[PDB]
Amino acid sequence: KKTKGPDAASKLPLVTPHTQCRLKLLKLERIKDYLLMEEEFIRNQEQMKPLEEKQEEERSKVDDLRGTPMSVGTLEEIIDDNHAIVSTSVGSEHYVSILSFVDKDLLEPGCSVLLNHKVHAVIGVLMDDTDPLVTVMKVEKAPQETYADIGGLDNQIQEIKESVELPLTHPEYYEEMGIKPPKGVILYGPPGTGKTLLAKAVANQTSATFLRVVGSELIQKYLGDGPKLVRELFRVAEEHAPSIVFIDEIDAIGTKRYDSNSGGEREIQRTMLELLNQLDGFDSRGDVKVIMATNRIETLDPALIRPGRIDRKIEFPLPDEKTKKRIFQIHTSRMTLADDVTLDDLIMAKDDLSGADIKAICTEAGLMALRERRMKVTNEDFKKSKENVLYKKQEGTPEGLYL
Amino acid sequence: PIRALDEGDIALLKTYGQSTYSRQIKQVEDDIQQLLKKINELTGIKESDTGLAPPALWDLAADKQTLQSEQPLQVARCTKIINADSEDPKYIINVKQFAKFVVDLSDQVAPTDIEEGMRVGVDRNKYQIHIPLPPKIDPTVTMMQVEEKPDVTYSDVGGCKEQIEKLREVVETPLLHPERFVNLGIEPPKGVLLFGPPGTGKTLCARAVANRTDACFIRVIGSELVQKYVGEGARMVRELFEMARTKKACLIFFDEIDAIGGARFDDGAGGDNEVQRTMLELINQLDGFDPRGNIKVLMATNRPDTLDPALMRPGRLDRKIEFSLPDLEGRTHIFKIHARSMSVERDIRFELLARLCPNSTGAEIRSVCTEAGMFAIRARRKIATEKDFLEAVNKVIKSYAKFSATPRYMTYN
Amino acid sequence: MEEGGRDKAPVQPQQSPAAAPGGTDEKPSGKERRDAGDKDKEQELSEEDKQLQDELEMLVERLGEKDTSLYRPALEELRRQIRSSTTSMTSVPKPLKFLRPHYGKLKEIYENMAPGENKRFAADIISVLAMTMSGERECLKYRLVGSQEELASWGHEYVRHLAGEVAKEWQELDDAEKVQREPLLTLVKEIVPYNMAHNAEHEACDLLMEIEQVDMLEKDIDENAYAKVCLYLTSCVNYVPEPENSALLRCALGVFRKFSRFPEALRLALMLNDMELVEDIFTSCKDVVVQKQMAFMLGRHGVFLELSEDVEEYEDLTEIMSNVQLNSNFLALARELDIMEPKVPDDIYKTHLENNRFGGSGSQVDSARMNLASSFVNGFVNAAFGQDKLLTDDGNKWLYKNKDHGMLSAAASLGMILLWDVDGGLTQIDKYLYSSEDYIKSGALLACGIVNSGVRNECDPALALLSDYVLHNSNTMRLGSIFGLGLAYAGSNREDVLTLLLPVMGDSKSSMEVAGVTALACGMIAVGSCNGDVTSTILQTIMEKSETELKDTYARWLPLGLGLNHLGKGEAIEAILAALEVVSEPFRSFANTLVDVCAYAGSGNVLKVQQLLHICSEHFDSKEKEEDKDKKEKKDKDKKEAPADMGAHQGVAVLGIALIAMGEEIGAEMALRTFGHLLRYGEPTLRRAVPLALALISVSNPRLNILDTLSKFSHDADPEVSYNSIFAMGMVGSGTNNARLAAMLRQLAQYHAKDPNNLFMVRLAQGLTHLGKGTLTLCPYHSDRQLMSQVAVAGLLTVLVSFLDVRNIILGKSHYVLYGLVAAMQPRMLVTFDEELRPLPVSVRVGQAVDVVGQAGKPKTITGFQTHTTPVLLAHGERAELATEEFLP
Amino acid sequence: IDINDVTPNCRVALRNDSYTLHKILPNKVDPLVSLMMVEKVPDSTYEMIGG
Ligand SMILES: Nc1ncnc2c1ncn2[C@@H]1O[C@H](COP(=O)(O)OP(=O)(O)OP(=O)(O)O)[C@@H](O)[C@H]1O
Ligand SMILES: Nc1ncnc2c1ncn2[C@@H]1O[C@H](COP(=O)(O)OP(=O)(O)OP(=O)(O)O)[C@@H](O)[C@H]1O
Numbered sequence A: 001k002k003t004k005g006p007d008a009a010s011k012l013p014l015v016t017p018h019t020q021c022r023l024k025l026l027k028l029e030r031i032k033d034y035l036l037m038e039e040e041f042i043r044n045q046e047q048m049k050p051l052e053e054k055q056e057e058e059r060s061k062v063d064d065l066r067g068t069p070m071s072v073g074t075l076e077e078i079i080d081d082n083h084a085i086v087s088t089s090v091g092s093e094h095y096v097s098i099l100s101f102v103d104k105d106l107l108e109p110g111c112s113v114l115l116n117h118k119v120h121a122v123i124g125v126l127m128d129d130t131d132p133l134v135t136v137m138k139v140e141k142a143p144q145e146t147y148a149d150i151g152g153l154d155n156q157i158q159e160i161k162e163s164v165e166l167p168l169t170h171p172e173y174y175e176e177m178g179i180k181p182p183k184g185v186i187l188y189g190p191p192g193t194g195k196t197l198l199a200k201a202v203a204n205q206t207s208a209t210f211l212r213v214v215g216s217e218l219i220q221k222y223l224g225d226g227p228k229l230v231r232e233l234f235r236v237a238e239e240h241a242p243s244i245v246f247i248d249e250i251d252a253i254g255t256k257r258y259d260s261n262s263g264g265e266r267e268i269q270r271t272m273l274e275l276l277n278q279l280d281g282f283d284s285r286g287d288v289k290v291i292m293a294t295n296r297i298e299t300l301d302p303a304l305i306r307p308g309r310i311d312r313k314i315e316f317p318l319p320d321e322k323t324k325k326r327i328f329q330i331h332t333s334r335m336t337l338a339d340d341v342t343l344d345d346l347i348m349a350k351d352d353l354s355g356a357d358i359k360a361i362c363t364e365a366g367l368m369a370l371r372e373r374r375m376k377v378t379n380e381d382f383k384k385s386k387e388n389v390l391y392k393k394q395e396g397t398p399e400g401l402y403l
Numbered sequence B: 001p002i003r004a005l006d007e008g009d010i011a012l013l014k015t016y017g018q019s020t021y022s023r024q025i026k027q028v029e030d031d032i033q034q035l036l037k038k039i040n041e042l043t044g045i046k047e048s049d050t051g052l053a054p055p056a057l058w059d060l061a062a063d064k065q066t067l068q069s070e071q072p073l074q075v076a077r078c079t080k081i082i083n084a085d086s087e088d089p090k091y092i093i094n095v096k097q098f099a100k101f102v103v104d105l106s107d108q109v110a111p112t113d114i115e116e117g118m119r120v121g122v123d124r125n126k127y128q129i130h131i132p133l134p135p136k137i138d139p140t141v142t143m144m145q146v147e148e149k150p151d152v153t154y155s156d157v158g159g160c161k162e163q164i165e166k167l168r169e170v171v172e173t174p175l176l177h178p179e180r181f182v183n184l185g186i187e188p189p190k191g192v193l194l195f196g197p198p199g200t201g202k203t204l205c206a207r208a209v210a211n212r213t214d215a216c217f218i219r220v221i222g223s224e225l226v227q228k229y230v231g232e233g234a235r236m237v238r239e240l241f242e243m244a245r246t247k248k249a250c251l252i253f254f255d256e257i258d259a260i261g262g263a264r265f266d267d268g269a270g271g272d273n274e275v276q277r278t279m280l281e282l283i284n285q286l287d288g289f290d291p292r293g294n295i296k297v298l299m300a301t302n303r304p305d306t307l308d309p310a311l312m313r314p315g316r317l318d319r320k321i322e323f324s325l326p327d328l329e330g331r332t333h334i335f336k337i338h339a340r341s342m343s344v345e346r347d348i349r350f351e352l353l354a355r356l357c358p359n360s361t362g363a364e365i366r367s368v369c370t371e372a373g374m375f376a377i378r379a380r381r382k383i384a385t386e387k388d389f390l391e392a393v394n395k396v397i398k399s400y401a402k403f404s405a406t407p408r409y410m411t412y413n
Numbered sequence C: 001m002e003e004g005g006r007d008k009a010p011v012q013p014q015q016s017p018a019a020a021p022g023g024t025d026e027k028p029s030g031k032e033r034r035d036a037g038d039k040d041k042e043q044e045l046s047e048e049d050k051q052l053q054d055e056l057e058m059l060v061e062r063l064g065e066k067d068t069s070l071y072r073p074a075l076e077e078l079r080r081q082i083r084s085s086t087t088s089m090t091s092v093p094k095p096l097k098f099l100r101p102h103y104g105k106l107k108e109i110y111e112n113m114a115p116g117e118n119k120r121f122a123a124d125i126i127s128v129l130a131m132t133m134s135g136e137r138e139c140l141k142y143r144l145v146g147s148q149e150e151l152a153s154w155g156h157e158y159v160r161h162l163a164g165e166v167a168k169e170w171q172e173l174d175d176a177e178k179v180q181r182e183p184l185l186t187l188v189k190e191i192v193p194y195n196m197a198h199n200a201e202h203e204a205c206d207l208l209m210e211i212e213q214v215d216m217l218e219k220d221i222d223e224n225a226y227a228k229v230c231l232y233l234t235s236c237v238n239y240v241p242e243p244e245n246s247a248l249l250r251c252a253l254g255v256f257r258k259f260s261r262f263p264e265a266l267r268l269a270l271m272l273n274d275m276e277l278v279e280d281i282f283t284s285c286k287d288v289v290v291q292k293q294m295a296f297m298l299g300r301h302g303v304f305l306e307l308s309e310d311v312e313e314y315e316d317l318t319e320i321m322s323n324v325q326l327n328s329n330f331l332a333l334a335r336e337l338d339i340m341e342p343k344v345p346d347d348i349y350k351t352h353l354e355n356n357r358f359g360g361s362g363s364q365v366d367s368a369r370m371n372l373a374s375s376f377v378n379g380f381v382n383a384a385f386g387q388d389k390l391l392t393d394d395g396n397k398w399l400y401k402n403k404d405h406g407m408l409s410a411a412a413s414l415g416m417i418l419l420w421d422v423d424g425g426l427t428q429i430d431k432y433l434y435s436s437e438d439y440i441k442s443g444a445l446l447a448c449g450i451v452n453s454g455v456r457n458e459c460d461p462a463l464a465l466l467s468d469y470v471l472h473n474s475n476t477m478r479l480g481s482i483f484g485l486g487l488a489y490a491g492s493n494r495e496d497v498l499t500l501l502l503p504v505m506g507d508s509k510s511s512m513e514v515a516g517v518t519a520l521a522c523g524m525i526a527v528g529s530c531n532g533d534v535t536s537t538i539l540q541t542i543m544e545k546s547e548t549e550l551k552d553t554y555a556r557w558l559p560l561g562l563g564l565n566h567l568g569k570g571e572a573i574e575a576i577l578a579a580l581e582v583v584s585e586p587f588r589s590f591a592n593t594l595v596d597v598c599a600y601a602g603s604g605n606v607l608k609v610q611q612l613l614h615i616c617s618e619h620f621d622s623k624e625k626e627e628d629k630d631k632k633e634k635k636d637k638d639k640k641e642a643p644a645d646m647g648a649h650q651g652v653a654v655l656g657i658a659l660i661a662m663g664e665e666i667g668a669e670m671a672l673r674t675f676g677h678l679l680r681y682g683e684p685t686l687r688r689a690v691p692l693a694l695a696l697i698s699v700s701n702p703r704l705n706i707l708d709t710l711s712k713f714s715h716d717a718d719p720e721v722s723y724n725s726i727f728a729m730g731m732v733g734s735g736t737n738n739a740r741l742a743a744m745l746r747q748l749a750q751y752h753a754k755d756p757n758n759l760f761m762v763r764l765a766q767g768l769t770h771l772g773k774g775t776l777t778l779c780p781y782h783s784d785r786q787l788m789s790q791v792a793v794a795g796l797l798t799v800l801v802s803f804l805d806v807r808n809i810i811l812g813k814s815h816y817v818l819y820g821l822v823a824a825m826q827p828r829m830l831v832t833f834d835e836e837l838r839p840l841p842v843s844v845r846v847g848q849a850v851d852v853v854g855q856a857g858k859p860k861t862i863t864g865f866q867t868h869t870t871p872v873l874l875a876h877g878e879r880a881e882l883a884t885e886e887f888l889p
Numbered sequence D: 001i002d003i004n005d006v007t008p009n010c011r012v013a014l015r016n017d018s019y020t021l022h023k024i025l026p027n028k029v030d031p032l033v034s035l036m037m038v039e040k041v042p043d044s045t046y047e048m049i050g051g
């Protein structure tokens, strides 16, 4: 089936104007109108169409034959058409009889098999055994951001778009030459320079089944559970239709391997080895594309960054001049700036000013405004923020050593 | 001098600003947010309780016949037999994890049909013996066979002829032509471990062998070799080799054996204890007072220096094979192989890109052939050009993503 | 809690209210002095927006509330000396002191009267002093009065004055973003007299700055897609924009005509007093507009033909809708501009994957249905192209490997091949028309009628080309003649031709299917009154046996004869038509739903949509009589298919969730044409991939499968998109492979998918105007109700050719001389910028700037940069004419 | 109760023998991280914190 389960989101086609206006009022009213229409119709048609001759007496029979508290067990070497061996959670090998309700196909060794509580008997198949610690990594409420929200990263955004969106948007463009679409881009750069922002942007216009990881939640405390959570993650990814898995902060399980002496620093190594094996090893990999974000690309073990497993290493740098003004424009819009607080000045000066710094200056600026009892930011309210947000930073060479 | 904010101050602040229709906007947004919840609640996740074959294909039997299946045919429990007292009908069995017992043989089964070591179908209540069970073939162990033919031939594995010949001398000829090894009586070397920098085709050649193995090519998923409960790994490896010694000419590949193998030590938590035990079982099986037979082992690693000595020494792995970076001819052939399916202009000189990609590996050669027509797709052409490929090389390798030496740096002329 | 320094404010403004009660005793002038001082302080504090929490107001509201409440009426003395300033100083603390319970005194506190020069507060303040609160209050009061007591007291005049002053002064108080708020005020207020309120407002405000009018036009344009369920606002928002597009803006008037076209193309009201009254746009965009006006000639050639003095060369010029030479420029550009115009093989795209021949290694088949599908693709994919023909070069024997219906469809395909060929098609047609074959002549008549529905040529080779066979009483020939005439004269409204053909319907001579096809053709002809045909249809419905209709299958075509005539029309006559159609069996309810749907094409509402959606499925699934509950949903697209491309993403949700997952298992679960109609623009794996696949392999219902596959084809009318192909060819096997009907219908249209250089979208150039003739797609969709012997089993397989009244995609560039223009432009994706403080670029980046003529996809954008002699209309409607301008001086 | 309330990672008290769901036993895990919700409120008001 390989269901291409989307983020089950986008219930907000997005209100076009963000300035409080009757246009906004009318559009959101239309949204509510269709939502109420849907609710009404579904309820009404549930109540109507008197199919009360339901339950399909026969399905009632099946439920009757499969008693209460059915148990979850692992099927094992299947012996005969009408007979098979099962292994309960205590690891006890009962010898049950496969009843007729079970489709003889779909029951392969290692597939979780339902059972009758009293007389162990394979009653039905279960095709949803995803580790409850892995299903919690499927994004089902798409983060609210768009490529326009991010700014100043054209070249660094087109690269991700050419390996997370276009390959499934116009795949003819790629086959026409036969080059296999690039798979896996590592977004490395200094702290507070995007990275996660671009990740959420690509999550928004997904068209796929985004899986989110943490970079530390993979590590597990039971020998082997580590290098099986990753296996389950990518099994789910390949079972579901085209997907992109963002293994954020891969600096955690990525340290350069070494002849260690501890045990934890060997289990983590085994986890990285599982990651490498599956991402590019004897196997394949369908339409599964991996996005990795890190703060230090020099620490990642050469292997998890190779031009067959992670191509298109993006180099998100500290924002440049024009990008700074762009980001200020994008992050100062929804504020009632005065007529003398043009941002064309706060740029420059310090050569160290990241996007996080920009948003901090823009927020502790409105907060500063709410101190003279005003709702229109002021140039003093901005010049008093550089001395309160950007501080504690380190410095450089002593003047005189060079010019 | 920062006086706080008073309640009246907040109240006035909330109402002096442009909100002609803004209270309504917030209210409607809240209504939408509270309406989504109702909609999904009433259309919740259903129709997911699968596992039911369509009681239409066998609909007729999908009935009281099932109950007839139930009730009779008591569900048995598996168990082994550790003895069978001769001329004394008593048997002794060890079920599995519960306990041992002494059992009587049910009348329905003749004693001759039941032997020592076979799996019996002991019943509940009074543990009597019934229809014997055939020997187990574990699911994890049996889910390892290649059972396919990966789409990679030897031809596509370019840039290394000596390496391929070395591998073939142990993986193919010693099984597909024993004659050459008898006239001289040379014992076919067994155990080939492939080194190499990260990414050079070490796994490509392993895959290529699978396309002509004409036998089993069990692929050790090292991650599976380690499990929570102690002894699980040792049993896993023992079953691996026992199924190995059941066919003709079985080859077992241990991809990234660094995971299971490592220098032993008792300092940190007594080492890995369990992992080291699994490694020791593997070493004993490979070499010991129990000749293996007709099973060969191929293993690959990025760093052989971190392998336990009792496994790097000959005997366990004889034919070590460096997989060094390709030579000029190797690079040219590699480019040609990973360019034969590309819409490239005919006048492209691939002998030049090879020089312009020094100290690169096969994965880099790929990432250059690709991301080469990617610039063409960016330009919206259809036949990439030599300029495109050269720009790709300059943007992939040599300078890759970081070129510090540039500002007035021309000292190498 | 004592606040130093600031303690004075809660002091003196506290004593002054203490002196309010006393007054005449011991302080006669005290009253005047205190009021003057306090008014001065409040004005001073609130005028300058150096702060947004008003100090004096914050101090006063707490105590002075009761004092002023008991002092406004306590004095009771009606003079400006105290009363006027008292009322003013009490009104000011309304917005910030009065809570929600201010619906009763909302006006009484201040609206009783305007003290002195109450515009004074409105002078120094930039935008916010009170005027926004005042506007909100006035709108609320108007709503309150109009709810039940619209005939209000003498308050009419005062509010009119305040509204005029605010709209004329505060709106542009500093040229700020306040402009966006004036439309809000003038709309929520003076809904009926919005024309006059606007006249007062724009008497001076628009003219003082002709520049501001662009923002007004922008917001009204973006709003037109949103308005009341009844199109009185939408009609209102259509009259009002004409003056704004007038000399109050550039004399190009292109946008003026666009909006005037929006309101059901109200020719008489707006455009019928402009073409003969301007006569000064000849070197201006009038010519480009008329060439761009492929929507209406019955009112253009009926005027210029009678005049014969507006242009010295009536025969020359596009003469409005002579756009036939569209074929000229189309062929020229595709041949030269499109360097890739080769013949298209078929088997190549059929067996692209050699893995399909494994095992069998042959077993060639030449089944009739496969032959029919190949003939259908061969007739379509070369539309307007009579030069590429691989399998049609041997037509003498090709047209025979198919039944009579297949070969008739082949004739229709051949006719369409030479689409829009006034005379060039005759060379090919005659050679098979002179065949003495009933069905050959039938198909030829179909094709001749088709090929004459894009010009309205002076030679009119429809009425004089197929009327002779019209009266003949032979089923096939009469059907062909009637269908061809109806197609050719669909867009045009030739009443004489309508009347001449009508006796075919009104006479029992024609077969029942003949009457149905005649109704279809007349409806395509009609977008106005067609009262004769409506009377004929109603008579037919009266004199149509209950058993006749019950067994009637290829007979439900009639409701078109009421829809296409009254496309996009309001209740005034729609209710009468619905009532008059209440004279039949549940099939009368059928026709009711169909007629309402055919009326409201894109007029997104909630009243009719909700009522039909509810009743149709709540009244017909329970009893044996059913099959209505499908058409409502299957027509939600109509009246909703054009929600400014906004409600489409909601209609998708409702449809997919309901009409399939929890919809009716059999009948209603045919809500597959829904999406197909909604979005024929090609979608990458977002809203059509899963919804269409998850139903494609649903062998549970063959009708489901066929309909959803046809939708799959429709979703890519002319994008030639390839990702669809991953199914349009991967369907063979792993699901439906050779299930005769399924195996055919899949390809039959999935290879209609890659139609080149064409467009089937229903919106006009600006992405928001509908085509009256463009609705003809309703024919190939309702006629696709089941396809079970309707299309799927060839019973009338000629609509599939009927719907090919289709616009192109090209983006030309020439100026009334020739295609001497090969300039550079950068179309890209379109991102609207309705509200922005600065002229930010509409799109994030320049994108593509292909020099060649733009085969503009769905959301394209503006032309090349550098002000390289930019045009005048500035609409980019696929026919723009670039005008010379001062560039590179 | 009706499934609606019960969500993944939601402890539920099941009946004995029958094993039919009974209550949404709130008790949402928290082994020892559940020892950090300060309950005995400390004793320090800005009156003493000077400067
Ligand atoms: N160029 C930029 N344009 C717009 N917003 C930016 C830009 N750079 C940073 N930001 C903002 O900075 C904020 C901080 O989060 P962000 O996603 O940028 O961090 P990051 O780079 O992922 O950090 P980390 O190094 O911790 O992973 C975000 O909300 C993001 O919108
Ligand atoms: N000499 C070569 N000739 C042709 N292709 C090569 C060569 N070396 C590497 N490649 C290509 O490199 C690609 C990536 O190799 P892959 O990472 O799967 O294996 P590996 O080089 O053995 O590395 P790893 O250490 O990760 O196992 C393969 O698909 C293969 O086609």
Ligand SMILES: [Mg+2]
Binding pocket: A211, A212, A213, A246, A248
């Ligand atoms: Mg994430």
Ligand SMILES: [Mg+2]
Binding pocket: A280, A281, A282, B202, B203, B255, B256, B300
């Ligand atoms: Mg490898």
